[PDB]
Design a protein around this nucleic acid. Structure first.
Ligand SMILES: [Mg+2]
Ligand SMILES: [Mg+2]
Ligand SMILES: [Mg+2]
Ligand SMILES: [Mg+2]
Ligand SMILES: [Mg+2]
Ligand SMILES: [Mg+2]
Ligand SMILES: [Mg+2]
Ligand SMILES: [Mg+2]
Ligand SMILES: [Mg+2]
Ligand SMILES: [Mg+2]
Ligand SMILES: [Mg+2]
Ligand SMILES: [Mg+2]
Ligand SMILES: [Mg+2]
Ligand SMILES: [Zn+2]
Lengths: 134, 29, 68, 141, 38, 71, 64, 143, 220, 155
RNA sequence: GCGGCUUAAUUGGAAAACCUCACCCGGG
RNA sequence: GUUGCUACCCCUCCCUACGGGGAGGGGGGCACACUAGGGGGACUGCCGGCGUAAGCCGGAGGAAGGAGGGGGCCACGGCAGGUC
RNA sequence: CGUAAACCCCGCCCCAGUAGGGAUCGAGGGCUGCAACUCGCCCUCGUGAACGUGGAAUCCCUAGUAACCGCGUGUCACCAACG
C-alpha cells in the first residue's frame, strides 16, 4: 500500500515513510548502489548516528541494493525523524522493488517497525500545567 | 477599552475583538 | 626540544613508555607525568605525526592512540 | 602542643546584627556552616556570641507547650564568656572552656578587644595536627 | 479546474475561566474554524 | 548440570506465581524448584523483589529458609 | 472492552429475539444486519451490539 | 632551548609565563580578553603564543600597548571614552583605573545626588529592588 | 513450567529438564549471509552470557547502532527486547542536563568500546557482558515494620531486577568519577567496565553489590 | 564533481586557503582585530584566518541557497546568546551584518558573487571555482573512501 | 508575589514612568 | 488540484576520472506527498485457560488491542468557599 | 517573520574560585515615548562577588511521557526570569 509502481519497464518505484513529522519519498530505478538523500550521498551524511540508521536497510540486503539507484526526498522532523523516515522508505522500497519476500522477513526480524511505521506522534500541552505531564 | 461595557482590565486586542475577557466567555457563542 | 614548553629529557621519556602500552590517552600521560592534559595532547599528536602512534578513536577531550 | 591560641583562631566569625530575628538566626547558621556566631550592633560593636546549643535550648525552653494546645538576636547573645589573651595555651583554654561551660572561648587582646574565637572543633583539629597517642577507651563516654 | 480545499483558518482565544483569579487555573479554549474552497 | 555461574549461590526455577506481599507489595511470592546442588528435589516458596515471570531462573544464596510474611 | 452497559445489553437482547434467525456466529455478518435492523447513529455502539449478539449465538448453540 | 620564564611583569603586573599571551594579559586590571586579543593581533604578536618565550622586543610593545591602548584601538574600544573631566578618549589601567573610577563615585557623594546617596549608603544604585534578594550576601563594589 | 503459551520471537533451549528461555534471536545475518557488527566493528556471534536467568533478559540480537525508539517500555518485560548495549547508552543521559542527548551517549559508549578492546584485546561486547555478571546482586533487603521501627529482611532479586541494578551501578559508578576532576567520561566508563569485568573491588559496581549482599546476610 | 559530493569541512578549508592566496580583493579590514562576529558573542574568533574562512563558508552557502542576501545570511550565522541580563534564559542572536556585508562586497569584486533582486547569487565563474576545488578534493577523497567512487567516477 | 518594617503614601483584595489608580501632597 | 507536490521531460550554467552528475527556467502531470469533506476500520472479534456468567489472563493477526491516545461536557447537595 | 536551539564536526582550554560564574560597579553609544532622575529596554570597553552541588523538610511525573532545547504568541508605545 505504501509502494506504487511509477513507470515499470525500467522499473521505477516511489516509496514513502514517515516518523513524527518527517516524510521520506524515495524513487528507485535500477542502477548501481548510489543513494542520494536530498542530493547528498549517504556515505557523506555528516551526523553519523542518523547516517547509520538510514543505511541499515541497505546493509541487511547484501547485494540486492547494489542494483538500484535510490533518491530520497526528506523534509521536516529533525535529524533523527528524517533518518527513521528515510530508513522506512528505503526498506519499504527494497521489499516492494525486488519482490523479495525473504527480505521482508529479514527486515521485520531486525526491526518489526521497519515497515509498520510509527503511529505515536506527540502530546499537547495542557493548560494550568508545565507541560503535557501525561 | 471594551465593547459590551467599559472595564479596561482585560482589554483584548487579539484580532480586532475588544472585550473584557469576562464578557467574552458570555458572548462567545 | 620539540614541543617548546616541554624539555627533551621528559618528552624522550614519554616517547619510550608509550611503546610498551597497549593503548594510551592524554589523561593517562598527564596523571602519570604530572603535566597538563593540554600539554599531554601535543606530545601525543607530535608522536602520531612522528609515526609511532596511530589515532584509533577520536573525540572531544580524549583521543585514543595505539603504538605502531 | 606548644601551640598558642593565635594559631587555632577563627578570625572572621559570621556576624548577625542585633535586630535580626531568630528565623534569620537559623538561616545564618545554615549559610555559615559554623557552630558559633558573633552578634554586633548598628555601630559594628560585637556584644556577644550565639552558639548552636544556646539557640536550641532557648527554642526548647521558650516554645514548649503542647498539652495546652488551643524577638531579635540581641536577646539570645551572651556578653560574658571565658576569655584568654593571644599567648594563651591550649590547656588553659580548654580548662577555661570547661569551667565556664561554653562551646568556645573569646580571645581578648591587651587593649581589651575581641580578635578571634576558638571552639571545640578547632581544639579537636589541633589535636589532629599534634595530639598524643591514646586509645579511645580512655576518652570514650 | 474544480473544487480545491484550501487549509482552514483556525482562530483561538484561550481565556481564563475566572472573574477574579480564585482557585485552580482553568482555561477556556474558544474556537472559530473557517474553511476556504476554490 | 551446572547452572549457576557463581559459587556461593544456587540456581532456582520459577514454577508458579503465588501472590504479592511486603509493605506496599513490592515483594511477590514464587514457587521455586531448586536447581543444581543440595536440595535438588526441594520446591521452595520465596520472596522475590522485582518483576518475576513464569519460567525465570533466579539464584538462591541460601536454600533452607522458605519464609513469607514481610508484614 | 471492559464491560458492556445496559443500553448495549438492552439494545442487543431485543434485536436478537425480534429477528432470531438473522444473526450468525460471526461478527462480520452480525455487523451488517444490526446496522440495517436498528437505528444506530454511532459506529462504536453498532460494533459493540454486533459483537455481543455474536456471543448469544455461541452460548445458545453451546447450550444445544 | 630557553627555559620558560615563570614570571613576566607587563603593565605593572606579575603575569604568568606559562599562559598564552592573550589570556595572560587579561590579568591586568584594565585589560580583558577582547582588549588582550586586539593588542596581540594589532602588534603582530600571535595571541596563542607562550608569553614566557616571547622576545623582549615584543614584551616592550606589550608593555607600551597595554599602557597606551588609546593610540592603537578605536575610540569605541576603550574603558574611558569622552572622559568626564578632560574629554579625551583614554584606556586607564591599574591604579589609575581605581583612582579614576573612585573619583566618579565620590563626586556623586559630594553632591548628594540619587546615585551618590545610594553609594554612600552601600546599596544598589541602578533601578532594582530591595524587598527581594535585595541585600547583598556578596560584595557590591568589586572595582 | 508453563501452560499459558509463549509469544513468538522467543526460544526454548531445554537442557536436562530446565527450560532455558531467550527472548531475542541471536541468529541474524545479512541477505548475503554476512554477520552484523555493532558499530560496524564488533561481532555478536562469539558473545556468550554465562548466567542462566540473565540469558532471558540480555538481548544479544545483532544490530548496527543500538537505537530503538523507546518502544519497548509499554508492556511488562518489554525491556528484554531492547539491545543490551542500548541499555548502556540509555543510562548515560543523566543528570538532567544530558537527558535526551543520545548522540553524545552513543559516542561515549563507542569510544569506550574502542578503549576496552585495545587495553584488553577482548571483544568489547563480551567484556561488558562479564561486567554485568560480576556486578548484578543476587540478594537484596526490604522494608518491614514491627510497630514503629522499620527493620529489614532479605529477599531474592528477580533476573530482570539484577540487570537494572548492575547497569545502574556501572553507569552511576563512572559518572561520579568524571565529576569535578580532569578525567574524561569515556575513560571513566571504560575503566569501570574493565574493572568490574575483572571482579576488582576498586570499581563502584563491585562495591555496591558487595554492600547490598553483605547487608542482606545480616538481615536474613 | 559537485559541491554536495564532498564534505563541507574539507571544501571550506581548501576554499579559504585559495582566497587567502589567490584573491587579493578579499582582505580583512582595519577594524577586524577589535570585533567579535556578532552582538552578544563572548570572545573574538581565535583563528587568525577567520576572515577568509567566513568568505569560504559564505561562498559554499551561496551555492546551495543562491539568492539569499545579507539579512538571511545573518540568520545562517546565528547563535544562542544571553541577550540582556546574563541571568536570563538564552535567545538566538543574528550575527553581525557589517562582516557579512563587506565579505559579500569583497567577493563580488573578485568576480565570484553577483547581486539580484532576491539576493546575492554566485556568478558562473564563482560556481566554477567552488566546483573545481570540490573536484580536487574528490580525487584524493576517493583514494581513502573508495565507496564514493560511484558518485564522481561511475563505472 | 505575599508578610513584616519604614513612609506623607507605600492601595484593596484572597507588561506600573503619564493613563492604569483605587494611595499621598498641592490645585480645579 | 488558480493554491501546494515534482517521478517525466527539454534550455541554460557548472563540474566532469568522461561515463555522467549537479543547480536554475519553462513545460507537462496530481503519479507521490500535501490540503479538506465523506466514508471504512476494532468488536474481546478468533484461538488456549479459568469462570454457571459479568468478565479476566496469555497468543495470533492486525495501522491501531483492550475504554486505541489527548481533551470538552461537571449529577443532587454543599464549602455563610471567590468575586459589590 | 523564517537557514530555530539543543545536536554533529574540527581547534584552544585541563581541576583552578579557573579561559567555570556573571552579581556589582565605572566610562561611552542607541531605541520607544509628551516625558526615561526616582523609575524603562538594547550594545561596547573595563571591573570579576557569592557559589565547588545545597540541612530539617519537601514537589512532580507511567512513553513520544519525564528531562533538556529553542520558536510563536497573550499582555504590549517600549520592556517576560510570567502564562
Ligand atoms: Mg513537547
Ligand atoms: Mg528592572
Ligand atoms: Mg571545580
Ligand atoms: Mg537556559
Ligand atoms: Mg523568529
Ligand atoms: Mg575568577
Ligand atoms: Mg566565563
Ligand atoms: Mg553612564
Ligand atoms: Mg532611568
Ligand atoms: Mg564585557
Ligand atoms: Mg566557597
Ligand atoms: Mg538542589
Ligand atoms: Mg504583537
Ligand atoms: Zn466587559
Amino acid at each position: 500500500p505504501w509502494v506504487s509502481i511509477l513507470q515499470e519497464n525500467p522499473r521505477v518505484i516511489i516509496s514513502v515513510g514517515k516518523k513524527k513529522t518527517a516524510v521520506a519519498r524515495a524513487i528507485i530505478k535500477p542502477g548501481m548502489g548510489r543513494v542520494r538523500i536530498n542530493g547528498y550521498p549517504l556515505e557523506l551524511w555528516p551526523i553519523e548516528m542518523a547516517r547509520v540508521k538510514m543505511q541499515e536497510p541497505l546493509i541487511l540486503a547484501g547485494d540486492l541494493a547494489k542494483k538500484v539507484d535510490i533518491e530520497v526526498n526528506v523534509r521536516g522532523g529533525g535529524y533523527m525523524g528524517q533518518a527513521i523516515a528515510t530508513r522506512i522508505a528505503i526498506a519499504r522500497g527494497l521489499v516492494a522493488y525486488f519482490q523479495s519476500e525473504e527480505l521482508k522477513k529479514l527486515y521485520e526480524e531486525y526491526d518489526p517497525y521497519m515497515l509498520k511505521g510509527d503511529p505515536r506522534r506527540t502530546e499537547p500541552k495542557k493548560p494550568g500545567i508545565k507541560h503535557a505531564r501525561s | 477599552r471594551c465593547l459590551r461595557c467599559g472595564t479596561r482590565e482585560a482589554v483584548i486586542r487579539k484580532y480586532g475583538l475588544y472585550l473584557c475577557r469576562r464578557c467574552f466567555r458570555e458572548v462567545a457563542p | 626540544r620539540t614541543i617548546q614548553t616541554l624539555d627533551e629529557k621528559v618528552f624522550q621519556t614519554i616517547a619510550k613508555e608509550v611503546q610498551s602500552l597497549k593503548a594510551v590517552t592524554p589523561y593517562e600521560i598527564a596523571t602519570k607525568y604530572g603535566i597538563k592534559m593540554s600539554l599531554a595532547f601535543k606530545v601525543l599528536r607530535a608522536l602520531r605525526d612522528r609515526g609511532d602512534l596511530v589515532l584509533v578513536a577520536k573525540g572531544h577531550r580524549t583521543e585514543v592512540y595505539v603504538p605502531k | 602542643t606548644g601551640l598558642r591560641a593565635r594559631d587555632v583562631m577563627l578570625s572572621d566569625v559570621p556576624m548577625v546584627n542585633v535586630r535580626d530575628p531568630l528565623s534569620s538566626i537559623r538561616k545564618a547558621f545554615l549559610r555559615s556552616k559554623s557552630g558559633i556566631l558573633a552578634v554586633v550592633d548598628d555601630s559594628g560593636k560585637v556584644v556577644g556570641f550565639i552558639t548552636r546549643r544556646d539557640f536550641m535550648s532557648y527554642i526548647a525552653e521558650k516554645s514548649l507547650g503542647y498539652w495546652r494546645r488551643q524577638g531579635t538576636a540581641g536577646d539570645l547573645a551572651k556578653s560574658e564568656y571565658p576569655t584568654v589573651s593571644e599567648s594563651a595555651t591550649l590547656e588553659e583554654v580548654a580548662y577555661k572552656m570547661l569551667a565556664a561551660g561554653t562551646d568556645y572561648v573569646v580571645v581578648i587582646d591587651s587593649a581589651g578587644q575581641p580578635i578571634g574565637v576558638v571552639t571545640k572543633d578547632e581544639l579537636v583539629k589541633a589535636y589532629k595536627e599534634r595530639g598524643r597517642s591514646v586509645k579511645v577507651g580512655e576518652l570514650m563516654t | 479546474r474544480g473544487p480545491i480545499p484550501l487549509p482552514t483558518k483556525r482562530l483561538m482565544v484561550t481565556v481564563r475561566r475566572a472573574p477574579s483569579g480564585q482557585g485552580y487555573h482553568t482555561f477556556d479554549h474558544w474556537e472559530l474554524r473557517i474553511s476556504k474552497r476554490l | 548440570v551446572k547452572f549457576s555461574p557463581y559459587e556461593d549461590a544456587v540456581a532456582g526455577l520459577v514454577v508458579q506465581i503465588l501472590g504479592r506481599t511486603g509493605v506496599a507489595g513490592e515483594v511477590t511470592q514464587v514457587k521455586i524448584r531448586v536447581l543444581e546442588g543440595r536440595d535438588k528435589g526441594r520446591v521452595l516458596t520465596r520472596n522475590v523483589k522485582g518483576p518475576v515471570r513464569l519460567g525465570d531462573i533466579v539464584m538462591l544464596r541460601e536454600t533452607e529458609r522458605e519464609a513469607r510474611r514481610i508484614t | 472492552g471492559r464491560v458492556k452497559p445496559k443500553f448495549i445489553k438492552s439494545l442487543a437482547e431485543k434485536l436478537l429475539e425480534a429477528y432470531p434467525d438473522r444473526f450468525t456466529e460471526s461478527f462480520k455478518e452480525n455487523k451488517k444486519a444490526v446496522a440495517e435492523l436498528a437505528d444506530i447513529p454511532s459506529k462504536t455502539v453498532r460494533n459493540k451490539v454486533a459483537g455481543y449478539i455474536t456471543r448469544l449465538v455461541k452460548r445458545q448453540k453451546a447450550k444445544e | 632551548a630557553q627555559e620558560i620564564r615563570a614570571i613576566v611583569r607587563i603593565g605593572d603586573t606579575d603575569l604568568d609565563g606559562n599562559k598564552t599571551v592573550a589570556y595572560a594579559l587579561a590579568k591586568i586590571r584594565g585589560i580583558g580578553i577582547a582588549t588582550a586579543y586586539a593588542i596581540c593581533r594589532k602588534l603582530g604578536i600571535d595571541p596563542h603564543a607562550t608569553l614566557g618565550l616571547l622576545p623582549e622586543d615584543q614584551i616592550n610593545k606589550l608593555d607600551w600597548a597595554v599602557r597606551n591602548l588609546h593610540e592603537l584601538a578605536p575610540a569605541w574600544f576603550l574603558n574611558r571614552r569622552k572622559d568626564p573631566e578632560t574629554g579625551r578618549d583614554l584606556h586607564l589601567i591599574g591604579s589609575e583605573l581605581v583612582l579614576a573610577a573612585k573619583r566618579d563615585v565620590d563626586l556623586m557623594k559630594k553632591l548628594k545626588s540619587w546615585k551618590g546617596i545610594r553609594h554612600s549608603l552601600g546599596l544598589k544604585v541602578r533601578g532594582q529592588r530591595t524587598v527581594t534578594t535585595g541585600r547583598f550576601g556578596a560584595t557590591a563594589g568589586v572595582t | 513450567i508453563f501452560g499459558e503459551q509463549l509469544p513468538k520471537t522467543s526460544r526454548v533451549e531445554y537442557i536436562g529438564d530446565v527450560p532455558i528461555i531467550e527472548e531475542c534471536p541471536r541468529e541474524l545475518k545479512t541477505l548475503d549471509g554476512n554477520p552484523i557488527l555493532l558499530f560496524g566493528k564488533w561481532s555478536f556471534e562469539d558473545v556468550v552470557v554465562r548466567d542462566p536467568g540473565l540469558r532471558r533478559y540480555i538481548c544479544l540480537k545483532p544490530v548496527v547502532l543500538p537505537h530503538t525508539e523507546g518502544r519497548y517500555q509499554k508492556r511488562r518485560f518489554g525491556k528484554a527486547h531492547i539491545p543490551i548495549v542500548e541499555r548502556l547508552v540509555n543510562l548515560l543521559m543523566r543528570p538532567g542536563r544530558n537527558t535526551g542527548k543520545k548522540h553524545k551517549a552513543y559516542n561515549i559508549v563507542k569510544r569506550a568500546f574502542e578503549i576496552i578492546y585495545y587495553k584488553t584485546g577482548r571483544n568489547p561486547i563480551q567484556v561488558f557482558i562479564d561486567a554485568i555478571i560480576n556486578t548484578a546482586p543476587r540478594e537484596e533487603i526490604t522494608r518491614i515494620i514491627m510497630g514503629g521501627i522499620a527493620y529489614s529482611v532479605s529477599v531474592d532479586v528477580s533476573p530482570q531486577r539484577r540487570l537494572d541494578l548492575s547497569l545502574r551501578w556501572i553507569t552511576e559508578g563512572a559518572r561520579q568519577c568524571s565529576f569535578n576532576n580532569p578525567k574524561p567520561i569515556e575513560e571513566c566508563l571504560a575503566d569501570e567496565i574493565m574493572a568490574a569485568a575483572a571482579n576488582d573491588p576498586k570499581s563502584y559496581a563491585v562495591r555496591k553489590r558487595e554492600e547490598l549482599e553483605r547487608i542482606a546476610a545480616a538481615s536474613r | 564533481t559537485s559541491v554536495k559530493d564532498v564534505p563541507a569541512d574539507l571544501l571550506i578549508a581548501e576554499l579559504a586557503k585559495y582566497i587567502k592566496d589567490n584573491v587579493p580583493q578579499v582582505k580583512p579590514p582595519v577594524w577586524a582585530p577589535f570585533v567579535k562576529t556578532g552582538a552578544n558573542k563572548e570572545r573574538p574568533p581565535m583563528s587568525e584566518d577567520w576572515w577568509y574562512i567566513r568568505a569560504a563558508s559564505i561562498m559554499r552557502k551561496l551555492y546551495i541557497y543562491g539568492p539569499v542576501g545579507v539579512g538571511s545570511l545573518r540568520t545562517a550565522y546565528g547563535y544562542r546568546a544571553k541577550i540582556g541580563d546574563k541571568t536570563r534564559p538564552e535567545r538566538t542572536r543574528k550575527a553581525g551584518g557589517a562582516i557579512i556585508r563587506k565579505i559579500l562586497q569583497q567577493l563580488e569584486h573578485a568576480g565570484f558573487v553577483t547581486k539580484t533582486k532576491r539576493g546575492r547569487v554566485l556568478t558562473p565563474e564563482g560556481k566554477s571555482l567552488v566546483d573545481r576545488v570540490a573536484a580536487r578534493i574528490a580525487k584524493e577523497l576517493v583514494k581513502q573512501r573508495p565507496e564514493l567512487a560511484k558518485y564522481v567516477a561511475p563505472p
